[PDB]
Design a protein around this ligand. Structure first.
Ligand SMILES: OC[C@H]1O[C@H](O[C@H]2[C@H](O)[C@@H](O)[C@@H](O)O[C@@H]2CO)[C@H](O)[C@@H](O)[C@@H]1O
Lengths: 144, 367, 20
């Protein structure tokens, strides 16, 4: 029922991009939806890299939960908007690539951790503001 | 559904005609047509149609279902200023608070009480246990003791929680969806007492809301369990009735689930700004609530100024007495699954389709 | 440094939100 609606939304918006950024899957394996939003997500990643070089040090499940939760709760305590969801997505992807590249086997814990936070703390806002259709429109409007 | 127009959903047992009169006043000042509807299976239809961008601009229902509506991204957030918040009791705001944010406007507090025909019975039984005997008394006269809705668990829960039954454990500010008190000692004691009342031919498992209403109003039965909305038809019937405390079960009070009628704004509504106007400035005034209360009583309303008058009504005081002895419903999204499960168990135990222990074990599992 | 990253994520977030 609705447990599966939440799954497909999060996977299209969040998981697909992380798995591409991690090289768990190729660009060709991304849906047309995922290929579109990847552009605005890629540009956010570039814009972020020009500001800061994030150095991660995570050796356990708990460190991931605590650190990830601390960052993203401050990101949205103020408010929620699509631009910040872009940052949420990209942040999740960078922590996950650190894990896979460190070979610590924790990347699935980052994805899952971000999946759960988006599900409970962001999805109500996302859906009540047009959900998938509006994020795609947001990403196409940014193409200007 | 249509910009420039308001569509409002409220359950059929409330004063939708009174609310329509408040809609006419709103249309007089703004020219915005206000259509009040009372669809069937309302609490279920809204998440269906709202999820696809349709449904009403405004949805009315007890607060317990809104947390689920909010979590599904179906509700716009309301923006009442502190000034307006001060006109309603804080505890009513607490029933519509979810994940830090107000998600609906509270209207009025609702609780089940015991309603009895004074002529047929001038001394309501203090305990549930003395009912079977008082029923054989009345069934020799041609009457019956108690008829109330058996098809909705809302009306059976007070007896279920009496001896310890609970929905979700409340500890430190978080509800435990793992700790459920639907199949613990108290619950099966309360439900078994109901089945035995059925088995022993005192009540009828088929009894629903309309059946129990006509039986009482027509003086065919001495007692019923209901809320404030139902008093009007009893006034119309002219039965000499009292509203009082629910009977106790094994020395402990019936613990009814307290409801707070609430109004949410569909997230897909293109009329949110006008929905706010209607709800704050037209409905939640001494005049708007009176219009609705004259059609069907709301109970103890959230509006301080207007509740001050209503509180003096003894029928309202009994509602608050049974309310203190009860508990405010949680609004977490899991409340729907809990009701569905308890709805199936009560129906199966009464019909003999399942043992009490079977019915409740399934409900504990599926909560 | 962690609160620094969340501030940065906010700004460039709000930036991308307005530029759309
Ligand atoms: O005014 C309260 C309203 O609901 C009652 O109980 C409902 C409950 O509020 C809902 O959450 C639902 O899922 O479960 C209950 C029914 O088992 C009564 O149904 C109704 O008479 C009353 O108007």
């Amino acid at each position: 029922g609705e447990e599966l609606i939440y799954h497909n939304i999060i996977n299209e918006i969040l998981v697909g991009y992380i798995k591409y950024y991690i090289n768990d899957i190729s660009e060709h394996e991304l849906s047309p939806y995922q290929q579109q939003i990847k552009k605005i997500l890629t540009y956010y990643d570039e814009c972020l890299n020009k500001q800061v070089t994030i150095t991660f040090s995570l050796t356990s499940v708990q460190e991931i939960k605590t650190q990830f939760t601390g960052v993203v709760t401050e990101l949205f305590k103020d408010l929620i908007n699509w631009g910040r969801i872009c940052g949420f997505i990209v942040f999740s992807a960078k922590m996950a690539k650190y894990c896979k590249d460190a070979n610590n086997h924790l990347e699935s814990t980052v994805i899952t951790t971000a999946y759960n936070f988006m599900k409970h703390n962001l999805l109500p806002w996302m859906i009540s503001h047009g959900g998938q259709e509006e994020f795609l429109a947001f990403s196409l409007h940014s193409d200007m | 559904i249509e910009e420039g127009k308001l569509v409002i959903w409220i359950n059929g047992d409330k004063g939708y005609n009174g609310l329509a009169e408040v809609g006419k006043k709103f249309e007089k000042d703004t020219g915005i047509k206000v259509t009040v509807e009372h669809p069937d299976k309302l609490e279920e239809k809204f998440p269906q149609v709202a999820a696809t961008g349709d449904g009403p601009d405004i949805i009315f229902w007890a607060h317990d279902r809104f947390g689920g509506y909010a979590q599904s991204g179906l509700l716009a957030e309301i923006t009442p200023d502190k000034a307006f918040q001060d006109k309603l009791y804080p505890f009513t705001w607490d029933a519509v608070r979810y994940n830090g944010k107000l998600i609906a406007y509270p209207i009025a507090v609702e609780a089940l009480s015991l309603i009895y025909n004074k002529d047929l019975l001038p001394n309501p039984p203090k305990t549930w246990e003395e009912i079977p005997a008082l029923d054989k008394e009345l069934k020799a006269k041609g009457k019956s003791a108690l008829m109330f809705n058996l098809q909705e668990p809302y009306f059976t829960w007070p007896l279920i929680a009496a001896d310890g039954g609970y929905a979700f454990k409340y500890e430190n500010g978080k509800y435990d969806i793992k700790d459920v008190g639907v199949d613990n000692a108290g619950a099966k004691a309360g439900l078994t007492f109901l089945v035995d009342l059925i088995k022993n031919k005192h009540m009828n498992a088929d009894t629903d809301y309309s059946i129990a209403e006509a039986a009482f109003n027509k003086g065919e039965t001495a007692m019923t369990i209901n809320g404030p909305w139902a008093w009007s038809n009893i006034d119309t019937s002219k039965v000499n009735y009292g509203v009082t405390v629910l009977p106790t079960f094994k020395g402990q009070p019936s613990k009814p689930f307290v409801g707070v009628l609430s109004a949410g704004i569909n997230a897909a509504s293109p009329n949110k700004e006008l929905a706010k106007e209607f709800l704050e400035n037209y409905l939640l005034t001494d005049e708007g609530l009176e219009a609705v209360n004259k059609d069907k009583p709301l109970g103890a309303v959230a509006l301080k100024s207007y509740e001050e008058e209503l509180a003096k009504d003894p029928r309202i005081a009994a509602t608050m007495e049974n309310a203190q002895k009860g508990e405010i419903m949680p609004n977490i999204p899991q409340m729907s699954a809990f009701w569905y499960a308890v709805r199936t168990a009560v129906i199966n135990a009464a019909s003999g389709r399942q043992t009490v222990d079977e019915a409740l074990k399934d409900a504990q599992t599926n909560s | 440094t962690m609160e620094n990253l969340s501030r940065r994520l906010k700004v460039t977030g709000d930036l991308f939100d307005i530029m759309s």
